[PDB]
A paper describes a structure:
In MINDY1 and MINDY2, a flexible loop (T130 to P138 in MINDY1 and T259 to P267 in MINDY2) connects β2 to α1, which we term the Cys loop since the catalytic cysteine sits at its base. In the apo-form of the DUB, this Cys loop occludes the catalytic center and would sterically hinder positioning of the scissile bond across the active site. The only significant change is in the Cys loop that undergoes significant remodeling, during which several hydrogen bonds are broken, accompanied by the formation of new bonds. In contrast, in MINDY2apo, the catalytic H448 is flipped out, and Q260 is not able to form a hydrogen bond. However, the binding of Ubprox brings H448 closer to the catalytic C266 to form a productive active site. For both MINDY2 apo and MINDY2∼Ub complex, computed data from the models yielded good agreement with the experiment, confirming the two structures in solution.
MINDY1 and MINDY2 are members of the MINDY family of deubiquitinases (DUBs) that have exquisite specificity for cleaving K48-polyUb, yet we have a poor understanding of their catalytic mechanism. Here, we analyze the crystal structures of MINDY1 and MINDY2 alone and in complex with monoUb, di-, and penta-K48-polyUb, identifying 5 distinct Ub binding sites in the catalytic domain that explain how these DUBs sense both Ub chain length and linkage type to cleave K48-polyUb chains. The activity of MINDY1/2 is inhibited by the Cys-loop, and we find that substrate interaction relieves autoinhibition to activate these DUBs. We also find that MINDY1/2 use a non-canonical catalytic triad composed of Cys-His-Thr.
Numbering used by the authors: 239 to 308, 317 to 498
The structure:
Amino acid sequence: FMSVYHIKWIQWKEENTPIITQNENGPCPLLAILNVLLLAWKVKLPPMMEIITAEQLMEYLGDYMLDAKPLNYEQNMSDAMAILHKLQTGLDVNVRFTGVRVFEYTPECIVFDLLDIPLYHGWLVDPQIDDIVKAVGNCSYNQLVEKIISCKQSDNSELVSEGFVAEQFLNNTATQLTYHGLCELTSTVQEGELCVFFRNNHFSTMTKYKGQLYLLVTDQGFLTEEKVVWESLHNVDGDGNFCDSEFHLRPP
Ligand SMILES: [Cl-]
């Protein structure tokens, strides 16, 4: 399977900087990870370049690992390279609902750790609602759907309660971003940090500028719109504000 991606050239901190736009693959982890490294100027593309294969994207990412090498790192780099192909053949990312950096460990955590790129989500139980805090506890998404099923079958009333309360949480927060998650993300990401944001099995490049969270606009529809670079993340539901590469509102 050969995939081709269109490169958008933007002015990022007053320097000519490429971003990879999504094709049929959509907002896959590979684009979100690459775009962090391109914006950080840790990977440079040829100034010509308009188009790039998934294969070349992979070569660039693996070359960046051998170049950023500073015996066991060899194993980890090799394991990361094998795992790196899962970044195109599905990533099973499993959040916990207790913190913006908390996920169930899967071997793909090897890639983010070796690349030293932070991974975040904002699917967070509101700590002010005690029955949800207790019902969800430390569950991963996958553990909670299992807990719901087990707990509804229980002869113990309390456990049947936690089951229904956990189901209510999943139904009511099905967008996979909560207001509390958005607040914890905003205060946790540092000014100018480049990072990956996980929501609804989609990966986005995220930054913070003057206290405000933005997602990099990767949608193919905006390839020639130089003034659409960032989208504000300021609410759980509805569209953010489209901004240029300097975070100013795109004129209507
Ligand atoms: Cl800036």
